[PDB]
Amino acid sequence: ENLWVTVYYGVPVWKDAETTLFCASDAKAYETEKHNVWATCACVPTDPNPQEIHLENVTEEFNMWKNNMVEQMHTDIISLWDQSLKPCVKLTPLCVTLQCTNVTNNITDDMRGELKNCSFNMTTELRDKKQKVYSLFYRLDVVQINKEYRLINCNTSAITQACPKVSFEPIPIHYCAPAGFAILKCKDKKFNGTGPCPSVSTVQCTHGIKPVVSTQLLLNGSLAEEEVMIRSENITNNAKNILVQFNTPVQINCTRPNNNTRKSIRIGPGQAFYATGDIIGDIRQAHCNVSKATWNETLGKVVKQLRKHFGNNTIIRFANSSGGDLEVTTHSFNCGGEFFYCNTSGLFNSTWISNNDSITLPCRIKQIINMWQRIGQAMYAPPIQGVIRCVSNITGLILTRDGGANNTSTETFRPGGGDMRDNWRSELYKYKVVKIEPLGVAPTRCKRR
Amino acid sequence: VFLGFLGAAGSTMGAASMTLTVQARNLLSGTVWGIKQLQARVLAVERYLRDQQLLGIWGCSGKLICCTNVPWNSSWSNRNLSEIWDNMTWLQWDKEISNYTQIIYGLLEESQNQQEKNEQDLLALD
Amino acid sequence: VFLGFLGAAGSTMGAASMTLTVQARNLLSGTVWGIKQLQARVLAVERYLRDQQLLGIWGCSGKLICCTNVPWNSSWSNRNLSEIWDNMTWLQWDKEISNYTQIIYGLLEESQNQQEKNEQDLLALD
Amino acid sequence: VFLGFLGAAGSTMGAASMTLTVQARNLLSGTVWGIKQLQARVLAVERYLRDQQLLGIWGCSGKLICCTNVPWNSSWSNRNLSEIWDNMTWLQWDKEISNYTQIIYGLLEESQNQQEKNEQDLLALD
Ligand SMILES: *[C@@H]1O[C@H](CO)[C@@H](O[C@@H]2O[C@H](CO)[C@@H](O[C@@H]3O[C@H](CO[C@H]4O[C@H](CO)[C@@H](O)[C@H](O)[C@@H]4O)[C@@H](O)[C@H](O[C@H]4O[C@H](CO)[C@@H](O)[C@H](O)[C@@H]4O[C@H]4O[C@H](CO)[C@@H](O)[C@H](O)[C@@H]4O)[C@@H]3O)[C@H](O)[C@H]2NC(C)=O)[C@H](O)[C@H]1NC(C)=O
Ligand SMILES: *[C@@H]1O[C@H](CO)[C@@H](O[C@@H]2O[C@H](CO)[C@@H](O[C@@H]3O[C@H](CO[C@H]4O[C@H](CO)[C@@H](O)[C@H](O)[C@@H]4O)[C@@H](O)[C@H](O[C@H]4O[C@H](CO)[C@@H](O)[C@H](O)[C@@H]4O)[C@@H]3O)[C@H](O)[C@H]2NC(C)=O)[C@H](O)[C@H]1NC(C)=O
Ligand SMILES: *[C@@H]1O[C@H](CO)[C@@H](O[C@@H]2O[C@H](CO)[C@@H](O[C@@H]3O[C@H](CO[C@H]4O[C@H](CO)[C@@H](O)[C@H](O)[C@@H]4O)[C@@H](O)[C@H](O[C@H]4O[C@H](CO)[C@@H](O)[C@H](O)[C@@H]4O)[C@@H]3O)[C@H](O)[C@H]2NC(C)=O)[C@H](O)[C@H]1NC(C)=O
Numbered sequence: 101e102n103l104w105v106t107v108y109y110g111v112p113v114w115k116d117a118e119t120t121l122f123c124a125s126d127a128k129a130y131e132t133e134k135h136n137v138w139a140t141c142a143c144v145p146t147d148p149n150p151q152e153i154h155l156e157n158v159t160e161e162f163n164m165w166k167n168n169m170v171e172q173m174h175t176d177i178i179s180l181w182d183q184s185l186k187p188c189v190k191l192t193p194l195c196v197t198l199q200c201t202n203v204t205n206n207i208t209d210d211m212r213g214e215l216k217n218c219s220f221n222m223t224t225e226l227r228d229k230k231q232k233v234y235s236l237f238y239r240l241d242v243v244q245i246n247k248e249y250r251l252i253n254c255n256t257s258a259i260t261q262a263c264p265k266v267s268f269e270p271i272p273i274h275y276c277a278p279a280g281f282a283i284l285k286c287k288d289k290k291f292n293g294t295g296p297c298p299s300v301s302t303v304q305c306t307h308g309i310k311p312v313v314s315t316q317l318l319l320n321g322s323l324a325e326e327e328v329m330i331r332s333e334n335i336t337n338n339a340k341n342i343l344v345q346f347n348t349p350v351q352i353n354c355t356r357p358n359n360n361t362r363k364s365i366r367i368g369p370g371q372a373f374y375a376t377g378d379i380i381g382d383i384r385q386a387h388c389n390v391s392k393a394t395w396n397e398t399l400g401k402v403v404k405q406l407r408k409h410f411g412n413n414t415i416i417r418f419a420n421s422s423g424g425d426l427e428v429t430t431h432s433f434n435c436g437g438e439f440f441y442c443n444t445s446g447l448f449n450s451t452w453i454s455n456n457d458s459i460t461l462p463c464r465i466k467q468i469i470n471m472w473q474r475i476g477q478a479m480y481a482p483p484i485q486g487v488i489r490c491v492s493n494i495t496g497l498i499l500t501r502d503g504g505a506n507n508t509s510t511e512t513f514r515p516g517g518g519d520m521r522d523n524w525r526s527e528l529y530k531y532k533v534v535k536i537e538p539l540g541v542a543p544t545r546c547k548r549r
Numbered sequence: 550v551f552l553g554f555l556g557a558a559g560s561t562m563g564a565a566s567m568t569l570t571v572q573a574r575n576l577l578s579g580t581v582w583g584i585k586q587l588q589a590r591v592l593a594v595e596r597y598l599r600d601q602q603l604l605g606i607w608g609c610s611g612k613l614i615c616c617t618n619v620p621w622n623s624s625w626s627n628r629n630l631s632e633i634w635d636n637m638t639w640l641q642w643d644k645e646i647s648n649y650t651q652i653i654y655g656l657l658e659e660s661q662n663q664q665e666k667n668e669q670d671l672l673a674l675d
Numbered sequence: 676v677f678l679g680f681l682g683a684a685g686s687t688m689g690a691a692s693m694t695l696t697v698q699a700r701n702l703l704s705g706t707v708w709g710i711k712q713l714q715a716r717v718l719a720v721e722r723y724l725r726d727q728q729l730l731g732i733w734g735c736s737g738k739l740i741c742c743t744n745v746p747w748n749s750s751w752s753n754r755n756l757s758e759i760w761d762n763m764t765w766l767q768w769d770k771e772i773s774n775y776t777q778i779i780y781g782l783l784e785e786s787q788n789q790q791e792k793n794e795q796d797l798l799a800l801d
Numbered sequence: 802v803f804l805g806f807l808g809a810a811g812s813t814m815g816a817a818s819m820t821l822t823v824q825a826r827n828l829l830s831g832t833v834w835g836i837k838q839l840q841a842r843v844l845a846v847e848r849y850l851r852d853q854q855l856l857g858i859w860g861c862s863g864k865l866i867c868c869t870n871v872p873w874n875s876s877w878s879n880r881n882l883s884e885i886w887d888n889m890t891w892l893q894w895d896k897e898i899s900n901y902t903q904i905i906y907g908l909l910e911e912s913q914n915q916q917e918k919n920e921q922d923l924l925a926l927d
């Protein structure tokens with residue numbers, strides 16, 4: 101009748117914790133080679149037949165806003181960027197005075213140049229005679245000084261040129277947990293991403309999450325189920341970003357109608373800088389198309405979900421960014437190696453009450469970037485030959501709400517971003533790390549003599 | 550039936566006691582960025598030998614299950630035999646006993662195999 | 676006679692069963708370029724504890740040899756007692772049984788010490 | 802009385818045989834400059850599993866103490882029962898037997914559990 105303790109080894113007992121996650125990225129991506137593209141070099145090949153065990157009767161609480169996988173992925177991509185830029189050519193002797201001029205074209209005065217044809221000195225292979233070579237830089241890359249210009253990053257940090265061998269192509273990366281840990285996955289169709297989850301399953305490795313670094317518009321993401329999803333840490337708080345996840349992807353097409361040439365000027369011995377030669381064809385600016393009908397149905401489907409949290413009979417007005425850096429006021433992204441910054445004033449210019457072509461957006465191109473708000477490392481994106489065309493999916497948004505309302509029933513939303521961790525939170529909301537404690541004692545009528 | 554690793558997580562302790570050999574099997578599993586997994590599998594084997602050391606100094610050694618000569622104190626959540634194995638999950642049980650786990654561990658490593666084995670040394674010489 | 680490490684590899688299984696304590700003895704053996712051997716002896720001890728864990732969760736624990744209550748299924752290459760120990764090498768045998776090793780492992784870790792020890796738990800209380 | 806870790810180092814072997822469970826308990830204990838302790842505690846667990854492997858392949862397994870069917874060779878410092886446990890320390894004894902430790906180890910791992918367990922396999926089939 102008197103019970104006795106008995107040690108059980110191998111009980112389904114886990115507790116929330118944080119550990120060191122490793123990678124996984126299939127086996128066909130390793131065949132992409134090209135001198136180690138992005139990260140996949142010594143990454144473990146993904147298991148051909150992954151197993152996902154649905155834990156019946158199990159209800160586990162998730163928290164996408166207090167999840168450590170986001171911070172780990174962020175620091176991992178940062179260290180990746182540094183390790184990818186450590187052995188590349190450093191452009192230390194490139195801050196020389198630039199005697200720039202307009203590009204060869206024919207007016208008007210509203211074209212504001214944008215492209216500057218700079219002539220300057222350069223150190224050759226030998227440490228004696230210099231080199232009077234010219235390049236073609238964007239206005240966002242240069243800045244005049246008292247026409248003589250200079251690189252915009254002179255009195256900020258150093259600069260290193262990205263090697264032409266590697267690529268900035270986001271490839272699916274599976275994050276896996278070591279022995280003794282497990283990743284819980286919420287498999288409900290309406291998980292707005294916080295609190296208890298009815299249908300929880302366990303996995304060793306997550307699905308292929310492509311590290312697409314972008315702002316305002318979530319590109320190449322996971323589609324939502326049924327209705328579009330709206331996630332926020334504090335809806336009443338207008339300082340917390342609002343991650344929107346789409347159900348139907350919005351087809352976007354971005355092009356660079358300036359098929360360019362790569363001049364291989366030689367800053368020897370060894371090093372070589374890739375300048376931009378003359379432009380073959382017409383002087384055109386990069387642009388992005390968004391299908392008017394798709395954008396209408398997507399916006400009309402989102403505002404119907406927005407009315408479920410800010411009152412049924414309210415007015416939702418869309419306005420573009422309030423201001424700041426170029427990475428926040430414009431849709432910043434990467435395509436073909438070039439870094440576009442597109443005008444998103446034609447997408448967020450609407451006013452919804454309670455009840456056939458394409459929208460083109462002006463896109464600028466910058467070569468000298470300082471992403472992740474990093475000071476000390478400026479990367480020069482080498483020019484890319486040929487017309488660059490890319491087709492992507494708009495699968496979500498990062499919105500911000502205006503404050504100090506009180507009066508009035510309308511609510512105004514503007515594109516935001518900045519913190520790149522939000523880009524990872526849009527994919528890690530359905531995963532969390534737990535540690536296994538298989539040692540459990542329990543009483544029963546068992547002993548020895 | 551084989552629910553798999555952590556299969557019987559939502560089942561009762563009596564039902565989850567049948568899946569002991571499943572969570573025990575997948576518990577060990579056999580330039581920078583490569584040391585990321587090294588330091589992790591080192592902490593993995595240190596966690597394994599830590600649990601094996603606790604399992605050894607107690608009156609078990611043989612894994613999975615083992616009995617002990619310790620009376621269950623009613624203050625440690627006075628529940629019944631049929632209310633534990635047929636009405637409570639292991640997570641729910643560990644949530645209540647989290648206060649007394651270290652106390653029981655102390656009553657298991659010190660009071661038992663330190664007094665029991667010395668008793669056997671006194672019983673084996675004659 | 677002591678043929679040494681891997682001595683009776685070409686000998687019959689019955690003859691090679693005498694050299695068990697030889698391959699088991701040399702199985703554990705007690706700035707860059709120095710981590711080359713570190714990560715190797717770490718995988719060496721992980722492979723050792725992996726085999727020791729499988730040898731422990733089964734009805735063995737005591738190494739070298741142990742018996743089990745599992746009927747030999749004829750589908751696993753139906754051979755005779757004298758046709759295995761006196762007419763086949765361990766490499767040739769493992770080449771045939773490679774399909775069913777994981778199945779037997781499942782019938783050893785789960786069907787035995789999970790039902791046998793619980794049976795003893797019922798037999799040791801009276 | 803509990804002298805602590807390495808307490809009975811200067812006491813006789815018979816007296817120091819009472820403190821076996823003390824030196825065995827504290828034998829495992831649960832950017833550069835941080836790998837200094839990592840490689841050390843890895844060699845610590847490799848030294849522990851090394852001694853556990855020797856203690857397992859012999860006729861012991863159960864730690865602390867175990868008896869064996871090996872005749873004490875008079876050439877290994879022919880001393881008396883009362884002249885060893887009541888007149889010699891473990892350091893002084895190991896200083897004399899250092900020549901024959903490896904020989905005895907060979908007579909323990911090979912001659913015993915390789916011939917004894919096979920004998921039991923012959924005794925357990927009938
Ligand atoms: C969201 O996800 C989508 C889906 O993948 C992704 O779209 C991808 O866009 C990128 C552009 O940013 C694409 O990658 C490039 O595609 C062009 C054009 O592809 C043609 O060529 C292949 C050849 O078989 C055809 O099959 C194909 O159908 C097209 O006709 C390629 O030309 C590019 O190749 C060069 O660039 C790579 C990176 O710079 C190099 O690694 C690669 O080795 C190639 O370099 C060599 O060739 C160059 C050619 O001139 C040469 O100049 C170089 O010096 C070098 O020698 C590149 O592969 C991709 O095609 C799109 N995906 C799909 C399915 O089509 C989005 O980019 C993504 N969103 C975000 C934000 O990342
Ligand atoms: C960016 O800015 C740089 C300058 O900093 C440019 O590079 C220069 O571009 C100009 C074109 O505007 C080049 O000028 C051309 O040079 C040619 C070289 O010919 C050499 O050999 C002949 C003998 O065969 C010599 O007579 C001559 O002096 C040279 O030594 C000339 O042949 C060209 O002449 C042709 O075009 C002109 C155009 O008006 C006609 O009038 C002529 O009749 C003839 O058809 C021309 O003079 C200059 O050489 C380039 N310099 C360097 C260092 O490359 C880029 O053009 C500019 N890019 C943009 C987009 O603005
Ligand atoms: C974007 O801008 C780039 C700038 O580099 C343009 O690239 C050049 O394009 C032209 C035109 O297509 C290419 O010129 C072609 O050269 C071919 C021969 O090249 C080989 O042989 C020479 C020696 O003779 C070598 O030096 C060279 O390396 C090659 O091995 C010709 O055969 C071509 O003529 C044929 O094609 C054209 C259409 O292209 C037909 O009209 C002709 O009738 C004929 O059938 C042609 O003259 C040049 O080689 C390209 N350079 C590079 C580096 O690629 C892109 O064309 C431009 N794209 C767009 C869309 O604007």
Ligand SMILES: *[C@@H]1O[C@H](CO)[C@@H](O[C@@H]2O[C@H](CO)[C@@H](O)[C@H](O)[C@H]2NC(C)=O)[C@H](O)[C@H]1NC(C)=O
Pocket residue numbers: 351352353389390391458491
């Ligand atoms: C992006 O470009 C693709 C390719 O041109 C467009 O898809 C085409 O759409 C038209 C109109 O429906 C069809 O007739 C073509 O057959 C489609 N082609 C392909 C390859 O799909 C797409 O509409 C463009 N989207 C935007 C927003 O510009």
Ligand SMILES: *[C@@H]1O[C@H](CO)[C@@H](O)[C@H](O)[C@H]1NC(C)=O
Pocket residue numbers: 201202212213214
């Ligand atoms: C181009 O030329 C015009 C006319 O001299 C001048 O005013 C202007 O500053 C130049 N540069 C740009 C970028 O327009």
Ligand SMILES: *[C@@H]1O[C@H](CO)[C@@H](O)[C@H](O)[C@H]1NC(C)=O
Pocket residue numbers: 220221230231232
């Ligand atoms: C460098 O710039 C100077 C401007 O003072 C100019 O005189 C010279 O021609 C340029 N190029 C070379 C190769 O010196």
Ligand SMILES: *[C@@H]1O[C@H](CO)[C@@H](O)[C@H](O)[C@H]1NC(C)=O
Pocket residue numbers: 396397400
């Ligand atoms: C957008 O769609 C909504 C809802 O169907 C609508 O009232 C409106 O007329 C559409 N706008 C355009 C420009 O078609």
Ligand SMILES: *[C@@H]1O[C@H](CO)[C@@H](O)[C@H](O)[C@H]1NC(C)=O
Pocket residue numbers: 420421422423429430444445
């Ligand atoms: C928003 O669009 C307006 C056009 O009405 C433009 O003047 C403004 O600069 C834009 N602001 C941002 C931050 O894009």
Ligand SMILES: *[C@@H]1O[C@H](CO)[C@@H](O)[C@H](O)[C@H]1NC(C)=O
Pocket residue numbers: 443444445
């Ligand atoms: C974006 O487009 C709007 C509308 O054409 C324009 O008023 C605004 O100045 C543009 N923003 C930038 C930064 O060019």
Ligand SMILES: *[C@@H]1O[C@H](CO)[C@@H](O)[C@H](O)[C@H]1NC(C)=O
Pocket residue numbers: 445449450
């Ligand atoms: C926004 O849309 C309204 C209505 O079509 C239009 O009057 C206004 O000019 C637009 N703003 C911009 C910057 O295009």
Ligand SMILES: *[C@@H]1O[C@H](CO)[C@@H](O)[C@H](O)[C@H]1NC(C)=O
Pocket residue numbers: 320349351492493
């Ligand atoms: C992007 O959307 C298009 C349009 O339906 C689809 O064909 C493509 O598979 C999508 N890409 C994804 C989901 O990665």
Ligand SMILES: *[C@@H]1O[C@H](CO)[C@@H](O)[C@H](O)[C@H]1NC(C)=O
Pocket residue numbers: 622623624625
């Ligand atoms: C049992 O628990 C009670 C109440 O907490 C306490 O008074 C008593 O000391 C405990 N006894 C043991 C052996 O733990």
Ligand SMILES: *[C@@H]1O[C@H](CO)[C@@H](O)[C@H](O)[C@H]1NC(C)=O
Pocket residue numbers: 101627628629630
């Ligand atoms: C059942 O619970 C009661 C009340 O706490 C207690 O008196 C009794 O000892 C318990 N019996 C068993 C078998 O646990």
Ligand SMILES: *[C@@H]1O[C@H](CO)[C@@H](O)[C@H](O)[C@H]1NC(C)=O
Pocket residue numbers: 644645646647648
């Ligand atoms: C744990 O102990 C604390 C402090 O005595 C107490 O507040 C709490 O109720 C206890 N919880 C459980 C589950 O025993």
Ligand SMILES: *[C@@H]1O[C@H](CO)[C@@H](O)[C@H](O)[C@H]1NC(C)=O
Pocket residue numbers: 748749750751
């Ligand atoms: C033995 O194998 C045969 C044929 O493959 C099959 O019918 C039978 O179920 C198997 N039994 C066991 C216990 O493996």
Ligand SMILES: *[C@@H]1O[C@H](CO)[C@@H](O)[C@H](O)[C@H]1NC(C)=O
Pocket residue numbers: 749753754755756757
């Ligand atoms: C030999 O194998 C056959 C076929 O499985 C069987 O009938 C027979 O009993 C076996 N004999 C011995 C001696 O093992």
Ligand SMILES: *[C@@H]1O[C@H](CO)[C@@H](O)[C@H](O)[C@H]1NC(C)=O
Pocket residue numbers: 770771772773774
């Ligand atoms: C292994 O299994 C496969 C698949 O059934 C079969 O083709 C092969 O004959 C088997 N080999 C042995 C040695 O049993």
Ligand SMILES: *[C@@H]1O[C@H](CO)[C@@H](O)[C@H](O)[C@H]1NC(C)=O
Pocket residue numbers: 874875876877904908
């Ligand atoms: C005992 O010692 C003697 C002399 O040192 C030696 O001849 C003999 O081999 C030893 N016995 C064993 C079992 O090694």
Ligand SMILES: *[C@@H]1O[C@H](CO)[C@@H](O)[C@H](O)[C@H]1NC(C)=O
Pocket residue numbers: 879880881882
């Ligand atoms: C005692 O020591 C002597 C001298 O070495 C020896 O002859 C005798 O065998 C020893 N006896 C015992 C019981 O050890």
